Amino acid sequence: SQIPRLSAINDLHKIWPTVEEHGAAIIESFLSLDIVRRLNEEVDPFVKIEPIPAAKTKDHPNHVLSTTTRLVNVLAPISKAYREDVLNSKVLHRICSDAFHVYGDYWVLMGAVMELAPSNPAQPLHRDMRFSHPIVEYLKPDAPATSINFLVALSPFTAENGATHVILGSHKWQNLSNVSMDATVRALMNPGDALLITDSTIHCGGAETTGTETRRLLTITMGISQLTPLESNLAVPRPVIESLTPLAQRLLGWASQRSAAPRDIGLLTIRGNSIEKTMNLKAEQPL
Numbered sequence: 290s291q292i293p294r295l296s297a298i299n300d301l302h303k304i305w306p307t308v309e310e311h312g313a314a315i316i317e318s319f320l321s322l323d324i325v326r327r328l329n330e331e332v333d334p335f336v337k338i339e340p341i342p343a344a345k346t347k348d349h350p351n352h353v354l355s356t357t358t359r360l361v362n363v364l365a366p367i368s369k370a371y372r373e374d375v376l377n378s379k380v381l382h383r384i385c386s387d388a389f390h391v392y393g394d395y396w397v398l399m400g401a402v403m404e405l406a407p408s409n410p411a412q413p414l415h416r417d418m419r420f421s422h423p424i425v426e427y428l429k430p431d432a433p434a435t436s437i438n439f440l441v442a443l444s445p446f447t448a449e450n451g452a453t454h455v456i457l458g459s460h461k462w463q464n465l466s467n468v469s470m471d472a473t474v475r476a477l478m479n480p481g482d483a484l485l486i487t488d489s490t491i492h493c494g495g496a497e498t499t500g501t502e503t504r505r506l507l508t509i510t511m512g513i514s515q516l517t518p519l520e521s522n523l524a525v526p527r528p529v530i531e532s533l534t535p536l537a538q539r540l541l542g543w544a545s546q547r548s549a550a551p552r553d554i555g556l557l558t559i560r561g562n563s564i565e566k567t568m569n570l571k572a573e574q575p576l
Protein backbone atom coordinates (compact mmCIF):
# COMPACT_ATOMS: atom_id res chain seq x y z
CA SER A 290 0.00 0.00 0.00
CA GLN A 291 1.79 3.10 -1.29
CA ILE A 292 1.71 6.74 -0.36
CA PRO A 293 -1.17 8.56 -2.03
CA ARG A 294 -0.12 11.02 -4.66
CA LEU A 295 -2.07 14.15 -5.37
CA SER A 296 -1.87 17.14 -7.62
CA ALA A 297 -1.30 20.51 -6.08
CA ILE A 298 -3.61 22.19 -8.61
CA ASN A 299 -6.34 19.74 -9.40
CA ASP A 300 -6.64 17.84 -6.12
CA LEU A 301 -6.20 20.64 -3.60
CA HIS A 302 -9.24 19.99 -1.43
CA LYS A 303 -8.32 16.36 -1.16
CA ILE A 304 -4.89 16.85 0.34
CA TRP A 305 -5.65 17.37 4.01
CA PRO A 306 -8.38 14.73 4.07
CA THR A 307 -5.89 12.28 2.55
CA VAL A 308 -3.24 13.00 5.21
CA GLU A 309 -5.78 13.00 8.02
CA GLU A 310 -6.82 9.50 6.92
CA HIS A 311 -3.55 7.84 5.90
CA GLY A 312 -0.95 9.93 7.77
CA ALA A 313 0.95 10.93 4.63
CA ALA A 314 0.45 12.14 1.06
CA ILE A 315 2.72 13.28 -1.76
CA ILE A 316 1.90 16.66 -3.30
CA GLU A 317 3.18 16.61 -6.84
CA SER A 318 4.59 19.94 -7.95
CA PHE A 319 4.20 21.66 -4.60
CA LEU A 320 6.90 24.11 -5.60
CA SER A 321 7.68 24.91 -9.23
CA LEU A 322 11.10 23.97 -10.54
CA ASP A 323 12.01 27.66 -10.75
CA ILE A 324 11.30 28.24 -7.05
CA VAL A 325 13.36 25.12 -6.30
CA ARG A 326 16.17 26.50 -8.35
CA ARG A 327 16.23 29.87 -6.67
CA LEU A 328 15.97 28.40 -3.18
CA ASN A 329 18.87 26.08 -3.85
CA GLU A 330 21.07 28.91 -5.17
CA GLU A 331 20.17 31.19 -2.26
CA VAL A 332 20.81 28.65 0.52
CA ASP A 333 23.82 26.88 -1.14
CA PRO A 334 26.59 28.80 0.65
CA PHE A 335 24.85 28.68 4.03
CA VAL A 336 24.62 24.95 3.73
CA LYS A 337 28.30 24.67 2.98
CA ILE A 338 29.43 26.61 6.02
CA GLU A 339 27.07 24.93 8.42
CA PRO A 340 28.92 22.76 10.94
CA ILE A 341 27.82 19.42 12.38
CA PRO A 342 24.46 19.51 14.20
CA ALA A 343 26.16 19.18 17.63
CA ALA A 344 29.08 21.48 16.95
CA LYS A 345 30.93 22.51 20.06
CA THR A 346 30.50 26.11 19.05
CA LYS A 347 26.68 26.03 19.35
CA ASP A 348 24.88 26.73 22.60
CA HIS A 349 21.80 24.77 21.42
CA PRO A 350 23.51 21.78 19.77
CA ASN A 351 21.35 19.16 18.08
CA HIS A 352 22.53 15.82 19.45
CA VAL A 353 19.93 13.80 17.54
CA LEU A 354 20.82 14.40 13.89
CA SER A 355 23.68 12.46 12.33
CA THR A 356 27.06 14.11 11.79
CA THR A 357 26.49 13.75 8.02
CA THR A 358 23.40 15.94 8.20
CA ARG A 359 23.50 19.72 7.73
CA LEU A 360 20.45 21.74 8.78
CA VAL A 361 19.97 25.45 8.13
CA ASN A 362 16.88 27.15 9.57
CA VAL A 363 15.70 30.79 9.82
CA LEU A 364 15.63 31.00 6.03
CA ALA A 365 13.79 34.31 5.63
CA PRO A 366 16.94 36.45 5.83
CA ILE A 367 18.76 34.17 3.41
CA SER A 368 16.20 33.50 0.78
CA LYS A 369 13.88 35.59 -1.29
CA ALA A 370 12.17 32.58 -2.81
CA TYR A 371 11.44 31.27 0.67
CA ARG A 372 10.09 34.43 2.25
CA GLU A 373 8.08 35.44 -0.81
CA ASP A 374 7.01 32.37 -2.75
CA VAL A 375 7.05 29.65 -0.09
CA LEU A 376 5.59 31.64 2.77
CA ASN A 377 2.71 32.80 0.56
CA SER A 378 2.05 29.42 -1.07
CA LYS A 379 -1.64 29.10 -1.80
CA VAL A 380 -1.42 25.40 -1.59
CA LEU A 381 0.31 25.48 1.78
CA HIS A 382 -2.24 27.86 3.23
CA ARG A 383 -5.24 25.95 2.07
CA ILE A 384 -3.86 22.74 3.56
CA CYS A 385 -2.97 24.49 6.82
CA SER A 386 -6.32 26.23 7.18
CA ASP A 387 -7.97 22.85 6.48
CA ALA A 388 -5.82 21.12 9.12
CA PHE A 389 -5.86 23.74 11.83
CA HIS A 390 -9.27 25.31 11.76
CA VAL A 391 -10.36 23.66 14.95
CA TYR A 392 -7.49 25.40 16.79
CA GLY A 393 -7.12 28.79 15.11
CA ASP A 394 -4.18 30.54 13.45
CA TYR A 395 -1.06 28.59 12.50
CA TRP A 396 2.54 29.65 11.92
CA VAL A 397 5.97 28.29 10.98
CA LEU A 398 7.42 26.17 13.78
CA MET A 399 10.49 25.60 11.63
CA GLY A 400 11.50 26.10 8.02
CA ALA A 401 14.83 24.41 7.33
CA VAL A 402 16.99 23.11 4.53
CA MET A 403 18.52 19.75 5.30
CA GLU A 404 21.33 18.25 3.26
CA LEU A 405 22.48 14.70 3.71
CA ALA A 406 26.01 13.71 2.75
CA PRO A 407 26.76 10.65 0.60
CA SER A 408 26.28 7.44 2.62
CA ASN A 409 24.16 9.20 5.25
CA PRO A 410 22.61 6.38 7.31
CA ALA A 411 18.89 5.99 7.78
CA GLN A 412 17.37 7.79 10.73
CA PRO A 413 15.64 5.77 13.44
CA LEU A 414 11.89 5.64 12.96
CA HIS A 415 10.36 8.51 14.88
CA ARG A 416 7.58 10.99 15.45
CA ASP A 417 8.49 14.66 15.25
CA MET A 418 8.27 17.25 18.07
CA ARG A 419 9.52 14.95 20.86
CA PHE A 420 12.80 16.80 21.45
CA SER A 421 11.18 20.23 21.64
CA HIS A 422 7.50 19.95 22.68
CA PRO A 423 6.98 17.31 25.40
CA ILE A 424 3.50 18.74 25.79
CA VAL A 425 2.41 16.97 22.62
CA GLU A 426 2.76 13.55 24.19
CA TYR A 427 0.17 14.54 26.79
CA LEU A 428 -2.55 15.18 24.20
CA LYS A 429 -5.40 12.70 23.97
CA PRO A 430 -4.76 10.17 21.24
CA ASP A 431 -7.58 11.49 19.15
CA ALA A 432 -6.76 15.17 19.38
CA PRO A 433 -6.46 16.82 16.00
CA ALA A 434 -2.86 17.20 14.84
CA THR A 435 -1.24 20.39 16.21
CA SER A 436 1.60 20.43 13.64
CA ILE A 437 2.32 18.96 10.22
CA ASN A 438 5.54 18.71 8.22
CA PHE A 439 6.01 19.45 4.51
CA LEU A 440 9.14 17.67 3.38
CA VAL A 441 9.91 19.25 0.04
CA ALA A 442 12.38 17.62 -2.26
CA LEU A 443 15.04 20.01 -3.42
CA SER A 444 16.74 17.19 -5.34
CA PRO A 445 15.45 13.80 -6.51
CA PHE A 446 14.29 11.34 -3.84
CA THR A 447 15.03 7.75 -4.88
CA ALA A 448 15.07 4.51 -2.98
CA GLU A 449 18.80 4.38 -3.61
CA ASN A 450 19.65 7.82 -2.31
CA GLY A 451 17.67 7.65 0.94
CA ALA A 452 14.12 8.77 0.15
CA THR A 453 12.06 9.16 3.32
CA HIS A 454 10.25 6.15 4.74
CA VAL A 455 6.78 6.43 6.25
CA ILE A 456 4.43 4.01 7.95
CA LEU A 457 0.93 4.61 6.64
CA GLY A 458 -1.74 4.79 9.29
CA SER A 459 0.84 5.11 12.05
CA HIS A 460 -0.42 8.54 13.05
CA LYS A 461 -3.24 6.63 14.73
CA TRP A 462 -1.09 3.97 16.46
CA GLN A 463 -1.00 3.94 20.21
CA ASN A 464 0.67 0.55 20.53
CA LEU A 465 4.11 0.76 18.92
CA SER A 466 5.03 -2.90 18.91
CA ASN A 467 4.74 -3.13 15.16
CA VAL A 468 7.21 -0.44 14.41
CA SER A 469 9.77 -1.70 12.02
CA MET A 470 11.23 -0.82 8.71
CA ASP A 471 9.23 -3.71 7.40
CA ALA A 472 6.12 -1.62 7.71
CA THR A 473 7.34 1.35 5.73
CA VAL A 474 6.87 2.59 2.18
CA ARG A 475 9.02 5.19 0.39
CA ALA A 476 8.45 8.75 -0.74
CA LEU A 477 9.86 8.76 -4.27
CA MET A 478 9.84 12.28 -5.46
CA ASN A 479 11.00 14.76 -8.07
CA PRO A 480 12.34 18.14 -6.98
CA GLY A 481 9.44 20.36 -5.99
CA ASP A 482 7.30 17.45 -4.85
CA ALA A 483 6.43 17.44 -1.15
CA LEU A 484 5.78 14.65 1.36
CA LEU A 485 3.19 15.83 3.88
CA ILE A 486 2.98 14.07 7.27
CA THR A 487 1.55 14.91 10.69
CA ASP A 488 3.38 15.12 14.00
CA SER A 489 2.14 11.58 14.76
CA THR A 490 3.26 9.94 11.49
CA ILE A 491 6.12 7.50 12.11
CA HIS A 492 8.85 8.13 9.53
CA CYS A 493 12.57 8.33 8.98
CA GLY A 494 15.11 9.55 6.49
CA GLY A 495 16.38 6.66 4.37
CA ALA A 496 19.87 5.25 3.95
CA GLU A 497 21.96 6.81 1.20
CA THR A 498 23.32 3.73 -0.63
CA THR A 499 24.92 5.14 -3.80
CA GLY A 500 27.88 6.62 -1.93
CA THR A 501 27.86 9.58 -4.35
CA GLU A 502 24.54 11.46 -4.24
CA THR A 503 23.86 14.45 -1.98
CA ARG A 504 20.13 14.64 -1.16
CA ARG A 505 18.56 17.94 -0.08
CA LEU A 506 15.12 18.91 1.19
CA LEU A 507 13.14 21.83 2.57
CA THR A 508 11.27 20.83 5.74
CA ILE A 509 8.47 23.23 6.71
CA THR A 510 6.86 22.35 10.04
CA MET A 511 3.59 24.25 10.29
CA GLY A 512 1.85 24.32 13.65
CA ILE A 513 -0.89 26.05 15.57
CA SER A 514 0.07 29.48 16.85
CA GLN A 515 -0.50 28.24 20.36
CA LEU A 516 2.79 26.26 20.16
CA THR A 517 6.18 27.92 20.32
CA PRO A 518 8.39 27.70 17.21
CA LEU A 519 11.62 25.76 17.25
CA GLU A 520 13.29 28.70 15.53
CA SER A 521 13.24 32.43 16.10
CA ASN A 522 12.90 35.29 13.63
CA LEU A 523 13.51 37.93 16.30
CA ALA A 524 16.91 38.78 14.80
CA VAL A 525 15.71 39.06 11.18
CA PRO A 526 16.32 42.63 10.03
CA ARG A 527 13.28 44.92 10.10
CA PRO A 528 13.63 45.92 6.44
CA VAL A 529 13.33 42.24 5.50
CA ILE A 530 10.25 41.75 7.67
CA GLU A 531 8.58 44.86 6.23
CA SER A 532 9.14 43.55 2.68
CA LEU A 533 6.86 40.56 3.41
CA THR A 534 3.14 40.19 3.10
CA PRO A 535 1.10 40.54 6.34
CA LEU A 536 0.46 36.81 6.12
CA ALA A 537 4.18 35.99 5.92
CA GLN A 538 4.86 38.36 8.81
CA ARG A 539 2.34 36.49 10.91
CA LEU A 540 3.92 33.16 10.01
CA LEU A 541 7.28 34.39 11.27
CA GLY A 542 5.93 35.64 14.61
CA TRP A 543 5.95 39.34 13.58
CA ALA A 544 2.20 39.71 14.15
CA SER A 545 -0.34 38.88 16.80
CA GLN A 546 -2.22 35.59 16.47
CA ARG A 547 -5.78 34.35 17.03
CA SER A 548 -7.32 31.19 18.45
CA ALA A 549 -10.57 29.67 17.22
CA ALA A 550 -12.42 30.15 20.45
CA PRO A 551 -15.65 32.06 19.82
CA ARG A 552 -14.68 34.96 22.06
CA ASP A 553 -10.93 34.63 21.36
CA ILE A 554 -8.81 37.14 23.27
CA GLY A 555 -5.77 36.49 21.07
CA LEU A 556 -2.09 35.61 21.38
CA LEU A 557 0.92 37.97 21.48
CA THR A 558 -1.30 41.03 21.95
CA ILE A 559 -0.44 44.37 23.53
CA ARG A 560 -3.11 45.91 25.80
CA GLY A 561 -5.85 44.85 23.41
CA ASN A 562 -4.00 45.73 20.20
CA SER A 563 -1.86 43.79 17.77
CA ILE A 564 1.91 43.76 17.41
CA GLU A 565 1.62 45.12 13.90
CA LYS A 566 -0.75 47.88 14.97
CA THR A 567 1.40 48.78 17.99
CA MET A 568 4.66 48.84 16.08
CA ASN A 569 3.11 50.39 12.98
CA LEU A 570 4.74 47.58 11.04
CA LYS A 571 4.83 48.16 7.34
CA ALA A 572 4.19 45.37 4.80
CA GLU A 573 5.06 44.71 1.18
CA GLN A 574 7.78 47.31 1.04
CA PRO A 575 10.53 46.39 -1.35
CA LEU A 576 14.03 46.44 -0.02
Ligand SMILES: CN1C(=O)c2ccccc2NC(=O)/C1=C/c1ccccc1
Pocket residue numbers: 351353354401403412413415416417418419420421508510
Ligand atom coordinates in the same frame (compact mmCIF):
# COMPACT_ATOMS: atom_id res chain seq x y z
C1 LIG B 1 15.64 15.82 15.99
N1 LIG B 1 14.56 16.23 14.94
C2 LIG B 1 14.86 17.32 14.21
O1 LIG B 1 15.94 17.86 14.31
C3 LIG B 1 14.28 17.70 13.15
C4 LIG B 1 14.81 17.98 11.89
C5 LIG B 1 14.07 18.44 10.80
C6 LIG B 1 12.71 18.71 10.92
C7 LIG B 1 12.12 18.51 12.14
C8 LIG B 1 12.85 18.03 13.16
N2 LIG B 1 11.96 17.86 14.72
C9 LIG B 1 12.49 16.53 15.42
O2 LIG B 1 11.70 16.11 16.17
C10 LIG B 1 13.55 15.79 15.03
C11 LIG B 1 13.37 14.38 14.99
C12 LIG B 1 14.42 13.26 14.73
C13 LIG B 1 14.36 12.05 15.47
C14 LIG B 1 15.24 11.04 15.29
C15 LIG B 1 16.21 11.20 14.36
C16 LIG B 1 16.31 12.36 13.64
C17 LIG B 1 15.41 13.38 13.82
Ligand SMILES: O=C(O)CCC(=O)C(=O)O
Pocket residue numbers: 412417440451452453454492493494495506
Ligand atom coordinates in the same frame (compact mmCIF):
# COMPACT_ATOMS: atom_id res chain seq x y z
O1 LIG C 1 15.76 12.79 5.79
C1 LIG C 1 14.50 12.71 5.66
O2 LIG C 1 14.00 12.44 4.54
C2 LIG C 1 13.57 12.91 6.86
C3 LIG C 1 14.19 13.87 7.88
C4 LIG C 1 13.39 13.83 9.19
O3 LIG C 1 12.39 13.19 9.31
C5 LIG C 1 13.84 14.62 10.41
O4 LIG C 1 15.02 15.08 10.48
O5 LIG C 1 12.99 14.80 11.33
Ligand SMILES: [Fe+3]
Pocket residue numbers: 415416417492493
Ligand atom coordinates in the same frame (compact mmCIF):
# COMPACT_ATOMS: atom_id res chain seq x y z
FE1 LIG D 1 11.21 13.66 11.25
